[PDB]
Design a protein around this ligand. Structure first.
Ligand SMILES: NC(=O)C1=CN([C@@H]2O[C@H](COP(=O)(O)OP(=O)(O)OC[C@H]3O[C@@H](n4cnc5c(N)ncnc54)[C@H](O)[C@@H]3O)[C@@H](O)[C@H]2O)C=CC1
Ligand SMILES: Cc1cc2nc3c(=O)[nH]c(=O)nc-3n(C[C@H](O)[C@H](O)[C@H](O)COP(=O)(O)O)c2cc1C
Ligand code: SF4
Ligand code: FES
Ligand code: NA
Ligand code: NA
Lengths: 418, 156
C-alpha cells in the first residue's frame, strides 16, 4: 500500500550493517530482506539455547543505543534471574531534539528490527513483545504493522516458530504526544492504558515491569544490532570499532552542517570527524561554536577531538550532533532547550514541575531584556534545583545543557545581564 | 445519548480486540476518534470508557495528558509546525510567516472554514530536514512559500 509522506533523510555508512538497505530512502519489504540473507540469524538463534544468545550479546559489548549505554547482555541477565512470564519492549518513542536515527531503521528496513525483537524475545523467554512508537511517526506505525503481517505469513511469528516450540506475538502501540513516554517506566504505564508517569526505580523493569512482570526495554537501534551479533558471532562483531565499545553506531547530524543526516560509523570516530570528514563541514565554512548532544549536553569548539563512544570522556548519549556556528546566539539556543523541558515534565515531582516551568519563564524574560536582578538570581537558583527528589532522568538533566552553556559561554550570558 | 457511527465503532472494537487487555487500546481508540471527528468530542469519552471497561475520569485524564488529542477545535487538517531547537535555528519563523501569508492564521488558530489548524509541536525527529511540518500524517521539509502553497493545495 501507500504510506504517509516522510522527508528523505540522507543516510551514509562506512560499515554497511544497520544502513545496508536503510541508506536508500524507501520501504524494503520481506522479499528484499530475505534476498540479503534476512531471518537466517533467527534460524541460527532458534538452534542455540536462550542462555547462549545472552552470552553472545554480553560478550559483543553491545551497549544501550537509547542514550544511557547500559550493557545489553547484562540487562537481559538481570531479567532472566526473575521468574516468568517475561515481556520484551522495543522503545520507538524517539523524541530527543536532533535525534532521528531510529526512524530510518523503522521506515526503511523494518524486518531488521523485527528479526532483532524475535531473537531478543527468545533470548529472555518472552512470548509477548511490544513496539511503542511515538504518535508523530504514523508512517513508521503503518510500515511496522504491514512488516509484522509479512513476518507472520513467512512463519517468523505466531506459535511454534519454525518447529522451535517458541511462540511470539508482537503488538504495536502508538504514543500520543508525550516525550516522557520514552522513559521506560512511563512507556510501560502508557502500554497499561494510563498516563505516562515514570515509576520510582528500583525496581527496574527487569525485576518489575509490564503488569509487574520481568520486562526488558531496549531501543530500536540496540535491537537492530542483535541479528548481526548472531550472524557474525560476537568475536567478529567485536572487530567493528574499538574492542571496548564495539559495533556500528548511528549518528544523527543536524543544524549548520553541509550534509545533515544519519551516519553509520564506528565509535572510535571523533566528533570533529563526524562534522568535517562525514557531514561535509559547516554551512558557509563558519567556525563551530557549540554541539548540542540533543537536549542533554553542550560541547564547545575546544571539545571536538573526543571519541563518539560511551567512555567517561566520550560524547556518549544518543550520538545526536546539533551543530551551532559562530553567529548562533547561545542564550536563544538555551531558551529553546528550556522551552522543551517546560513542555514535557509530567509534574509528579515538585522541583521538576515548578523548576522546568520557572527555568523557561525566567530565561524568556532574560532573552527579551525584561529580567529584574531577582529574575536573574532566580534563574540561576532554579537551574541548579530541578533535580532534587526527581524519580526519572528528565528532572535529573533539565538544567544540565543550560548550566554547561553558562560555564562554557559566560561572555555571551553577561551581554544579556547588561 | 451519544452513539458511535457503526463504521467508527467497528474500528474501535478492532483496537480493543488487538491487545491482550482492552484498556491497552485507549490511545489507538482516541487517535481513531480524532481521525473521524477532527477532534475528541467530550460526549465521545463516556461510551469509549464503557467499551474499554475503565472509569470515565481515567479516560478524561488520559485525553488531558496526551498533547496530540484536542477537545477544543475541530479541524480537517492539522498543520503541526516544529518550534524546537533545530527547526528554530534553520527557519521555523519563515515557515510560520509563509503559513500566515497563505492561510491568514497563526499558531493555535483555525481557518474560518475549519479546514486548517496550526499546532506548534516539539521536535518531530526529522531535524536534518528542518524546518519540519506535518499535514495530518504527512511530513515535509519547508523550502519556501511557493513550495508550501503547492503542498497545501493537495489537501482539499
Ligand atoms: N532516544 C531518545 O529519543 C531519547 C533518549 N534519552 C536518553 O535517555 C537516557 C536516560 O535514560 P534512563 O533510562 O533514565 O537511564 P539509566 O542509566 O537510568 O538506565 C538505562 C537502562 O539500564 C537499566 N538499568 C540501569 N541500572 C540498572 C540496574 N541496576 N539493574 C537493572 N537495569 C538497570 C534501566 O532499566 C534502563 O533500561 C539519557 O542518557 C538520554 O540520552 C532521553 C530522551 C529521549
Ligand atoms: C525522559 C526520558 C525519555 C526517554 N525517551 C527515550 C526514547 O524515546 N527512546 C529510547 O529508546 N529511550 C528513551 N529513554 C531511555 C529509556 O528510559 C531506556 O534507558 C532505554 O529505552 C533502554 O534501552 P537501551 O538500553 O537499549 O538504550 C528515555 C529516558 C528518559 C529519562
Ligand atoms: S523528574 Fe520530572 S518528568 Fe520525571 S517523573 Fe518527576 S516530574 Fe515527571
Ligand atoms: S527540531 Fe524540528 S524536527 Fe527536530
Ligand atoms: Na519493495
Ligand atoms: Na525515514
Amino acid at each position: 500500500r501507500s504510506y504517509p509522506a516522510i522527508p528523505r533523510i540522507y543516510a551514509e555508512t562506512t560499515l554497511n550493517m544497520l544502513l545496508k538497505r536503510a541508506k536508500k530512502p524507501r520501504v524494503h519489504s520481506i522479499d528484499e530482506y530475505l534476498k540479503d540473507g534476512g531471518y537466517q540469524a533467527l534460524e541460527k538463534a532458534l538452534n542455540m539455547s536462550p542462555e547462549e544468545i545472552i552470552d553472545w550479546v554480553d560478550k559483543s559489548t553491545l551497549r544501550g543505543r537509547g542514550g544511557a549505554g547500559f550493557p545489553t547482555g547484562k540487562k537481559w541477565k538481570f531479567a532472566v534471574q526473575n521468574p516468568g512470564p517475561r515481556y520484551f519492549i522495543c522503545n520507538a518513542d524517539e523524541s530527543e531534539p536532533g535525534t532521528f536515527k531510529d526512524r530510518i531503521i523503522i521506515e526503511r528496513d523494518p524486518h531488521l528490527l523485527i528479526e532483532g525483537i524475535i531473537i531478543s524475545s527468545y533470548a529472555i523467554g518472552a512470548n509477548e513483545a511490544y513496539i511503542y512508537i511515538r504518535g508523530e511517526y504514523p508512517a513508521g506505525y503503518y510500515i511496522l504493522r504491514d512488516a509484522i503481517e509479512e513476518a507472520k505469513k513467512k512463519g517468523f511469528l505466531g506459535k511454534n516458530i519454525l518447529g522451535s516450540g517458541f511462540d511470539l506475538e508482537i503488538y504495536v502501540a502508538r504514543g500520543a504526544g508525550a516525550y516522557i513516554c520514552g522513559e521506560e517506566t512511563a512507556l510501560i504505564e502508557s502500554l497499561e492504558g494510563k498516563r505516562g508517569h515514570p515509576r520510582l526505580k528500583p525496581p527496574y523493569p527487569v525485576q518489575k515491569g509490564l503488569w509487574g512482570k520481568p520486562t526488558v526495554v531496549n531501543n530500536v537501534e540496540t535491537i537492530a544490532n542483535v541479528p548481526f551479533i548472531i550472524s557474525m558471532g560476537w568475536e567478529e562483531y567485536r572487530y567493528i570499532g574499538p574492542s571496548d565499545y564495539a559495533g556500528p553506531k548511528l549518528f544523527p547530524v543536524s543544524g549548520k552542517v553541509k550534509k545533515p543526516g544519519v551516519y553509520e560509523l564506528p565509535m572510535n570516530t571523533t566528533l570533529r570527524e563526524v562534522i568535517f570528514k562525514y557531514a561535509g563541514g559547516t554551512l558557509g565554512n563558519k567556525k563551530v561554536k557549540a554541539v548540542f548532544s540533543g537536549a542533554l549536553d553542550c560541547f564547545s569548539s575546544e571539545e571536538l577531538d573526543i571519541p563518539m563512544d560511551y567512555s567517561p570522556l566520550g560524547f556518549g548519549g544518543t550520538g545526536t550532533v546539533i551543530v551551532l556556528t559562530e553567529e548562533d546566539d547561545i542564550v536563544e539556543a538555551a531558551l529553546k532547550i528550556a522551552e522543551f523541558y517546560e513542555h514535557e515534565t509530567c509534574g509528579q515531582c515538585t522541583p521538576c514541575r515548578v523548576g522546568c516551568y520557572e527555568q523557561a519563564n525566567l530565561l524568556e524574560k532574560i532573552y527579551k531584556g525584561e529580567a529584574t536582578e531577582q529574575d536573574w538570581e532566580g534563574f540561576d537558583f532554579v537551574n541548579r534545583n530541578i533535580q532534587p527528589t526527581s524519580i526519572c532522568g528528565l528532572g535529573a538533566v533539565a538544567g544540565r545543557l543550560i548550566r554547561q552553556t553558562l560555564e562554557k559561554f559566560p561572555e555571551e550570558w553577561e551581554k544579556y545581564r547588561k | 445519548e451519544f452513539e458511535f457511527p457503526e463504521e467508527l465503532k467497528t474500528k474501535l472494537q478492532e483496537h480493543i480486540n488487538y491487545f491482550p487487555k482492552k484498556r491497552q487500546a485507549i490511545l489507538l481508540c482516541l487517535h481513531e476518534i480524532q481521525n473521524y471527528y477532527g477532534y475528541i468530542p467530550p460526549e465521545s469519552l463516556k461510551p469509549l470508557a464503557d467499551m474499554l471497561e475503565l472509569p470515565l475520569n481515567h479516560v478524561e485524564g488520559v485525553v488531558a495528558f496526551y498533547d496530540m488529542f484536542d477537545r477544543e477545535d475541530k479541524a480537517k487538517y492539522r498543520i503541526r509546525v516544529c518550534v524546537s531547537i533545530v527547526c528554530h535555528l534553520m527557519g521555523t519563523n519563515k515557515l510560520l510567516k509563509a503559513l500566515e501569508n497563505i492561510l491568514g492564521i497563526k499558531p493555535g488558530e483555525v481557518t474560518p472554514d475549519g479546514k486548517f489548524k496550526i499546532v506548534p509541536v516539539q521536535c518531530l525527529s526529522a531535524c536534518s530536514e528542518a524546518p519540519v511540518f506535518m499535514v495530518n500524517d504527512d511530513e515535509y521539509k519547508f523550502e519556501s512559500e511557493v513550495q508550501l502553497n503547492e503542498i497545501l493545495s493537495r489537501y482539499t
